[PDB]
């Protein structure tokens, strides 16, 4: 047990013990980038690897070589926080040592000179935070891991649809990690073909010739040999007795003076056995049997020296005669069978246009780059640079691995390029599949699916950067002089920097972390995608890949995946899942040796898991863990059924691992249909943090792990006692055992305070500990947004009643009491960052000055002398946050305006008001202001005030650091001095500064005192340098965009509670929109007089089948019961005994659960705190599929004083009369998604307009009007409304005249329209007429 577990404990139902506990949920993200940037003294993936690949770069034959030595990542220019505030990128300089050697022309190889240029700078690269996040511009971002087709070879079917002959086809595909694709495919005529990439189809053998294989050797490779002998006269044949299988006798088969088979008798196993035992090597055959046989090799006349027959040519009765008289004894032919061993390659040669190697290379080079005249060196260079070049091609490790494995090879690791043996073996495998031996693989299987991650992809982009820098290096090394340039002038920065910046900045996989929520972050960081680079698209891949595969078990969550344009093209990583060594997906299991189920953990990949029979997470075993049933439900290969007691190799580790962390937070999930469950776990990520982090009243037990593993909370680095607790910071004094000898020290935690979150919500941390409290190592020292006492509260539980209330709950609609909006529980805090830009126009510079044309004293009131709003001033819509004015000269007025100015004597200002004003309707309080200034332009008054303030605050902070740290350090010297030197009262008298002189008796403690001295002075100077650096960071002008002189950022904190139109939902996939806010007066209540918070609609329950939401209600009620009872017994102030008794009774609950319990806990000061935290309700943990049962809940209801049915009598708060029938009341945990109505709501009358085509367009955040589409138009057409439609697409929108001419009539009180012609069609006329097309408008 831990220390916050003494604060609060969650009652846990369920039986199955957890053999393995949930690992770090952020594992994958951190591991990836940990591999990317790192020093690996070998070819393993990392910057080192990608470096070694392209390097060393040598010039063209000129013997000027540039080789790579070693690299380093400098310390970040700005730390996480500073870089987040300022808005720059959190990164490190990449400093790489390069050695430029120049070989003395005319080797033996030695260098005239080699300049080692010290660490030339190329690019800065982003860094991953401890939370697995990146900051691109001042914003936390995540790179989603990718799922693609693993490299190597793959054999498919493509039966059915092609050709409709049903004959199917068989194709192989070699997909490298990088480089051109290699494809082989058959056709209806059984002619083997080959294509590089998706390009033109070529006869297979044409590649073989390019490997320098003459026809004879191709045949020798793909066919066996049938030997014909002309011994004496009239032939003979060599016969392997197995050759006659699957064939019928073509003639009398007789040898050894004994007739084995006659004519017309198919050769069976009998004939074959007879031939085998009698051992007949040579038989006599007719001269006519070779009429169809194909001659293996070439044959010439020894005398005439002329070619008798070419290789792979059909023999005739005459050709035999023509090669027989020439003195030929032996004739080799192809062994061909239309069933067993097929004659494919022969016919393939029959379709081959080429002859020799050069010819093949010609057709290939003319295939890849067609239309341009081929050249020998060109074809050679191409073909050698396709699959055989170390540069332009590679499968890497996973590729070579899967390649060799699928080829039934031995070697698990090999070269990164293809070999003749490789291509040949692949072709052989394809031919074997067409022959009937071997099977075809499927893509959907997770063994063929590889998982990438941040580091790998970043490595790829950096690789592209390195190749484009390589081209430049060679380009310059072409003409270069000797000892002038060095590895600086060549290598640039921007090419690489933008190469990585383009990846992190804009990519489909690189996105902004969704931080509205601790679950959202952690479930985003664990995610998979089949989209992006190196993957399919929604418009391409069909239903197969999207669909769930049995291999998804334990690897990928079946029920968590977005519902929309891409379904199952994303999914999520499962709970206990891990990335395999080679990059596949493997899940934990339990090895079952003999008859015992062992607790040893074993990880099996998608392919590893295949043959083994795995048992069930839900299975009955006892004592030693032997299976209770004689047969138990299991799954072995692709399928599940009942299995013998001991046939079982393995078993599931947990009742969880099938699902993900999102689904694992859904209580009573087993009681919910998969559709609504999916919707539930989908919306659970949308929950906006509440004002008061509450707690789930009905839990799972994952919510602790989610809260802790996600970076939202603050966890103790080391255990000890709290020296200091503030809403700002928390200082813990470290225990000695955990403490390091030097520096002594205490752990100081600076808590994040109110600040902007990516979703504009609020992120703020509060201390969960009090002054002088014991804290265990790895314990929550504070809670983040939407977290309570180390658990995850995504929302707030509350009283719910199921019953129709006056149709206000009508569809999914939710009827909530006033008690909720009054208690401000569902209230939310939004932090909006608003910006003001001071730019440069040709008319002049823009000023932030407080002097604003046309504003009242009340308008300039909330602004200081400089024109920026004070910190803390509450503002609403229309208030001026930052005064800004831009020059616009010579207004060029008109006559009546001129008379007006002449009468009123008003000077029309040369300046126009651009001031940043709070967006319409939104209202909040200003929590901060920042001023970014171009370096070298004078800081204004306000900015200076702020700068000085920040300087002082910094000095105070640093001074606090040094004080707490120094006192903490000397407090150790006091303790060590007392051992061997002890003077209690004598020591603390003299000044502390002079303590360092005092020694000690000979011992290691003297050297300890020495340590404390060294580290003390270290801290003392470190303070100095840190102060200096902080000051410089404050004063320096941040680099801004072109034209912008200065920028003012105001941070508004808006507080919106709840109003009709907001979206709310449970964890069960039941949505709703708050309909009306009903007084506590009209609320249905019970006999006790306690009203209900929320009234749902029962009708929503049966149709969409989620019954869990009802169970969640019931248990919830019962849970609250245990609270209320305790709430009374605390209000009765009984004693420790009664309380403890009741609590224990609650935590036991009938029989057979795994929870255990107390009275190892201090019976007074500890227990009474737990009971104090339990009075709000009794938190319960319902495991995913291991969760509670009806009987357990009813029992808990008995303990609660509440009915079994979970239904009580309810009275209308209006009439006061009872409602007929009982109604279900309880506590259902409910969230608030951020759909909030004051966001969604939009209205526009007359706004701005698009330039290119005049159409309504919002430029002000004042929204463009709704889009009237084709379907809406049809809807108008169906009715008889012509004028509604005309006014819709003419005057209200597209007519540059009609709109204004309309407006004047609308204000004049005349409703008409003078439509004219829409500008769209008017432009179409010009576009058409711009061509050679004359379009005109006839008649009148």
């Amino acid at each position: 047990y831990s220390y916050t577990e003494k604060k609060r404990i969650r009652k846990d139902f369920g039986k199955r013990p957890q053999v393995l506990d949930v690992p770090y949920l952020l594992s994958i993200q951190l591991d990836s980038f940990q591999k990317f940037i790192e020093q690996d003294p070998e070819g393993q993936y990392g910057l080192e690897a990608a470096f070694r690949s392209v390097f060393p770069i040598q010039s063209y034959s000129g013997n000027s070589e540039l080789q790579y030595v070693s690299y380093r990542l400098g310390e970040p220019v700005f730390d996480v926080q500073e870089c987040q505030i300022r808005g720059v990128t959190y990164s490190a300089p990449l400093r790489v040592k390069l050695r430029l050697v120049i070989y003395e022309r005319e080797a033996p190889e030695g260098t005239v000179k080699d300049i080692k240029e010290q660490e030339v700078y190329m690019g800065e690269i982003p860094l991953m935070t401890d939370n697995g996040t990146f900051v691109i511009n001042g914003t936390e971002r995540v790179i989603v891991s990718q799922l693609h087709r693993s490299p190597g070879v793959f054999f498919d079917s493509d039966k059915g649809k092609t050709h409709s002959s049903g004959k199917v086809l068989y194709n192989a595909r070699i997909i490298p990690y990088r480089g051109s694709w290699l494809d082989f495919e058959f056709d209806p005529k059984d002619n083997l073909f080959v294509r590089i990439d998706r390009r033109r189809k070529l006869p297979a053998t044409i590649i073989l010739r390019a490997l320098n294989y003459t026809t004879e050797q191709i045949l020798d490779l793909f066919f066996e040999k049938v030997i014909f002998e002309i011994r004496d006269n009239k032939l003979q044949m060599e016969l392997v007795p197995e050759r006659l299988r699957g064939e019928t006798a073509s003639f009398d088969i007789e040898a050894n003076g004994k007739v084995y088979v006659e004519k017309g008798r198919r050769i069976t196993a009998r004939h074959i056995r007879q031939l085998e035992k009698d051992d007949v090597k040579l038989i006599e055959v007719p001269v006519e049997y070779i009429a169809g046989k194909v001659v293996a090799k070439d044959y010439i006349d020894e005398s005439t020296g002329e070619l008798i027959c070419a290789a792979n040519m059909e023999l005739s009765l005459d050709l035999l005669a023509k090669l027989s008289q020439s003195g030929h004894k032996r004739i080799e032919t192809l062994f061909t069978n239309d069933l067993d061993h097929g004659p494919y390659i022969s016919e393939t040669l029959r379709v081959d246009p080429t002859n020799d190697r050069l010819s093949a290379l010609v057709e290939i080079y003319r295939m890849m780059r067609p239309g341009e005249p081929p050249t020998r060196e060109a074809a050679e260079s191409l073909f050698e640079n396709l699959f055989f070049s170390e540069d332009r091609y590679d499968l890497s490790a996973v590729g070579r691995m899967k390649f060799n494995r699928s080829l039934l090879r031995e070697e698990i690791e090999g070269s990164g390029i293809l070999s003749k043996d490789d291509i040949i073996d692949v072709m052989k495998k394809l031919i074997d599949i067409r022959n009937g031996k071997g099977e075809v693989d499927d893509i959907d299987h997770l063994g063929n699916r590889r998982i990438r991650s941040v580091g790998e992809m970043a490595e790829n982009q950096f690789r592209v950067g390195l190749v484009r820098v390589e081209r430049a290096v060679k380009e310059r090394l072409s003409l270069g002089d000797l000892d002038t340039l060095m590895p600086q002038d060549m290598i640039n920065a921007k090419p690489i920097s933008a190469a990585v910046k383009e990846f992190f900045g804009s990519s489909q996989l690189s996105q902004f972390m969704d931080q509205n929520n601790p679950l959202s972050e952690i479930t985003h960081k664990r995610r998979i995608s089949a989209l992006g680079p190196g993957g399919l698209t929604r418009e391409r891949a069909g239903f197969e890949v999207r669909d769930v595969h049995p291999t998804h078990y334990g690897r990928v969550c079946p029920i968590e995946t977005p519902e929309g344009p891409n379904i199952g093209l994303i999914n999520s990583l499962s709970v206990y899942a891990q990335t395999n060594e080679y990059g596949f997906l493997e899940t934990p299991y339990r090895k079952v040796t003999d008859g015992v189920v062992t607790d040893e953990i074993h990880y099996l990949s998608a392919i590893e898991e295949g043959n083994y029979v795995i048992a069930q997470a839900n299975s009955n075993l006892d004592e030693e863990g032997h299976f209770v049933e004689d047969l138990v439900t299991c799954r072995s290969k692709g399928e599940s059924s009942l299995f013998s007691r001991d046939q079982v190799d393995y078993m599931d580790v947990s009742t969880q691992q099938v699902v993900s962390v999102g689904a694992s937070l859904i209580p009573f999930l087993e009681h919910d249909d998969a559709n609504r469950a999916l919707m539930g776990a989908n919306m659970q990520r949308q929950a906006v943090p509440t004002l008061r982090a509450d707690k789930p009243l009905v839990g799972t037990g994952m919510e602790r792990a989610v809260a802790v593993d996600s970076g939202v909370t603050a966890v103790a680095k080391r255990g000890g006692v709290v020296q200091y607790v503030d809403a700002s910071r928390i200082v813990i004094k470290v225990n000695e055992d955990e403490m390091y000898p030097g520096e002594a020290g205490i752990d100081i935690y600076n808590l994040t305070k109110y600040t902007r979150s990516n979703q504009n919500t609020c992120i703020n941390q509060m201390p969960c500990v009090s002054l002088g409290e014991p804290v265990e190592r790895g314990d929550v020292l504070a809670d983040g947004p939407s977290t309570d006492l180390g658990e995850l509260a995504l929302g707030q539980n509350m009283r719910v009643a199921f019953m129709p209330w006056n149709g206000y709950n009508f569809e999914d609609s939710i009827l909530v009491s006033e008690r909720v909006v009054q208690e401000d529980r569902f209230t939310t805090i939004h932090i909006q960052e608003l910006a003001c830009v001071s730019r440069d126009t040709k008319l002049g510079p823009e000023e932030i000055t407080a002097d604003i044309p046309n504003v009242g004293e009340a308008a300039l009131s909330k602004l200081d002398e400089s024109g920026i709003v004070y910190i803390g001033a509450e503002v609403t819509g229309g208030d001026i946050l930052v005064g800004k004015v831009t020059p616009k000269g010579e207004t060029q007025l008109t006559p009546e305006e001129k008379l007006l100015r002449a009468i009123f004597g008003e000077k029309a200002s040369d300046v126009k008001d651009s001031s940043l004003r709070v967006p319409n309707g939104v209202s909040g309080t200003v929590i901060d202001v920042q001023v970014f200034t171009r370096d070298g332009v004078e800081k204004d008054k306000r900015a200076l005030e702020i700068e000085e303030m920040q300087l002082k605050q910094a000095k105070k902070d640093l001074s606090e650091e040094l004080q707490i740290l120094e006192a903490g350090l000397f407090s150790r010297i006091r303790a060590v001095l007392v051992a061997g030197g002890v003077e209690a009262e004598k020591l603390d008298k003299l000044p502390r500064d002079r303590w360092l002189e005092l020694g000690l008796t000979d011992e290691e403690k003297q050297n300890q005192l020495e340590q404390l001295a060294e580290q003390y002075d270290e801290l003392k100077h470190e303070f100095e340098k840190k102060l200096e650096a902080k000051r410089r960071k404050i004063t320096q002008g941040d680099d801004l965009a072109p034209g912008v002189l200065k920028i003012v950022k105001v941070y508004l904190a808006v507080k919106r509670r709840i109003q009709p139109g907001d979206k709310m939902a449970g964890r069960h996939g039941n949505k709703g929109v708050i309909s009306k806010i009903n007084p506590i007066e009209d609320m249905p209540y019970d006999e006790n007089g306690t009203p209900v918070d929320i009234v749902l609609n029962p009708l929503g329950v049966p149709s969409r089948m989620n019954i869990g939401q009802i169970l969640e209600t019931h248990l919830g009620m019962a849970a609250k019961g245990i609270g209320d009872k305790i709430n009374a017994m605390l209000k009765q102030q009984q004693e420790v005994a009664k309380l403890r008794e009741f609590i224990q009774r609650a935590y036991d609950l009938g029989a057979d659960v795994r929870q255990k319990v107390d009275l190892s806990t201090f019976s007074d000061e500890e227990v009474m705190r737990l009971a104090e935290n339990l009075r709000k309700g009794m938190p319960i943990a319902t495991p995913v599929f291991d969760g509670a049962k009806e009987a357990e809940i009813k029992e808990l209801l008995k303990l609660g004083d509440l009915p079994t049915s979970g239904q009580i009598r309810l009275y209308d708060g209006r009439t006061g009369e009872q409602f007929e029938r009982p109604v279900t009341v309880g506590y259902m945990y409910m969230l608030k998604l951020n759909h909030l109505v004051d966001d969604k709501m939009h209205a526009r009358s007359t706004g701005s307009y698009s330039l290119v085509t005049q159409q309504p367009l919002g430029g002000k955040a004042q929204f463009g009007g709704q889009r009237f589409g084709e379907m809406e138009v049809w809807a108008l057409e169906a009715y008889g409304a012509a004028y509604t439609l005309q006014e819709m697409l003419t005057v209200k929108s597209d007519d540059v005249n009609g709109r204004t001419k309309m407006y004047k009539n609308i204000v004049d009180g005349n409703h008409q329209m003078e439509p004219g012609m829409p500008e769209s069609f008017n432009v179409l006329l010009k576009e058409i007429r711009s061509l050679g097309i004359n379009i005109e408008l006839e008649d009148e």
């Binding site: 409304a1281 003419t1290 007519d1295 069609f1321």
Partner: protein, 69 residues
């Protein structure tokens, strides 16, 4: 078939909507085809009252005025 019968429309402006625009414009432009409107889609594009519904009293009182005295 429906998708086939949809291909044939007097008005070329209508054909330019849901069919392949590039071909339609040319194929009409060679024959010097004259689109008289008269249909819904075309009048929707050109931005005048629909020759149906309320507008039927318009297009009628027009259509007869056309090709007559």
């Amino acid at each position: 078939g429906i998708t086939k019968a949809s291909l044939a429309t007097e008005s070329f402006i209508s054909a330019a909507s849901f069919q392949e625009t590039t071909r339609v414009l040319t194929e009409a432009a060679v024959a010097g085809k004259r689109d008289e409107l008269r249909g819904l889609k075309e009048n929707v594009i050109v931005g005048r009252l629909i020759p149906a519904g309320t507008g039927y009293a318009y297009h009628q009182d027009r259509m007869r005025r056309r090709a007559a005295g």
